[PDB]
């Protein structure tokens, strides 16, 4: 007799079959008064239009935020955010910072430990002393 377990579900592998960019929204805040936003205002007029036209899967929201530095706040599918203050940055520095939020995921930064990350079982199995030619001391 075989009883079925109904607590296990399938897991998604973003990239296999279909790809989905993790960055889903980009909040672009500026200031018409703060001098630290002179570069941000230029990024919104010179480079943001073409950058947004090339990333139609991201939602761009340009809203003023007077009395505050300019920030680039990205929202990710995992539910986290990443805000980068771009005060006193030139337009091309803003673009390089915006491409960082696009290419990035919401996951927290982690030190480099292992290149490969796998969930499927070993093709050759795991070693066992009871499945070889034995060992004589």
């Amino acid at each position: 007799t075989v009883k079925a377990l109904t607590q296990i579900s399938s897991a998604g592998r973003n990239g296999v079959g279909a790809f989905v960019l993790q960055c889903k929204k980009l909040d672009i805040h500026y200031s018409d008064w703060a001098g630290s936003s002179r570069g941000m205002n230029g990024f919104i007029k010179s480079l943001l239009p073409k950058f947004a036209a090339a990333n139609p899967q991201i939602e761009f929201v340009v809203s003023p935020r007077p009395a505050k530095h300019p920030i680039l706040m990205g929202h990710y599918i995992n539910g986290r955010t990443k805000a980068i203050c771009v005060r006193n940055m030139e337009p091309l520095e803003i673009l390089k910072k915006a491409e960082l939020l696009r290419d990035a995921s919401g996951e927290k930064p982690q030190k480099f430990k292992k290149p490969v990350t796998s969930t499927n079982p070993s093709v050759r199995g795991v070693w066992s002393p009871y499945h070889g030619q034995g060992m004589a001391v």
């Binding site: 480079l47 239009p49 073409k50 139609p56 091309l92």
Partner: protein
């Protein structure tokens, strides 16, 4: 021919005169390779540092670009599908599939010139309420 000279050991604790011999050969760091013609003025330069370098007779001289390409490993990958992107200086480059090869880059001052879907392109799509998939396809 030429002398292919490579610095194998260092001269840290060696006399100052030995450092000048290596400076005149052009050897500034370990395993650095230089090429010099086969002449007495260079042979005697090597007899002073023969305990530090490795010499070899070669027909021709290798260029700085050709000497560094013999240690370059194979990339191991080939970009066959590039998604739409925006190059700051050129413009917006449309998606290209090198597997079937067409990198067309469109620049302009209006959205229609960039080669992307605009709010107007979405409104005409919504008004085409008559188009219908063929019954066979369905």
């Amino acid at each position: 021919s030429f002398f292919r000279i490579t610095l194998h050991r260092s001269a840290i604790g060696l006399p100052k005169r030995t450092h000048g011999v290596l400076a005149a050969l052009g050897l500034r760091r370990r395993n650095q390779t230089v090429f010099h013609p086969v002449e007495p003025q260079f042979a005697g330069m090597l007899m002073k540092v023969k305990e530090l370098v490795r010499v070899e007779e070669v027909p021709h001289r290798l260029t700085k670009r050709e000497l560094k390409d013999e240690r370059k490993p194979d990339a191991g990958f080939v970009v066959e599908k590039q998604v739409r992107r925006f190059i700051p200086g050129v413009g917006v480059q449309d998606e290209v599939d090198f597997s079937k090869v067409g990198a067309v880059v469109r620049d302009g001052k209006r959205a229609g010139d960039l080669g992307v879907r605009t709010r107007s392109d979405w409104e005409v799509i919504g008004k085409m309420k008559s188009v219908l998939p063929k019954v066979k396809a369905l």
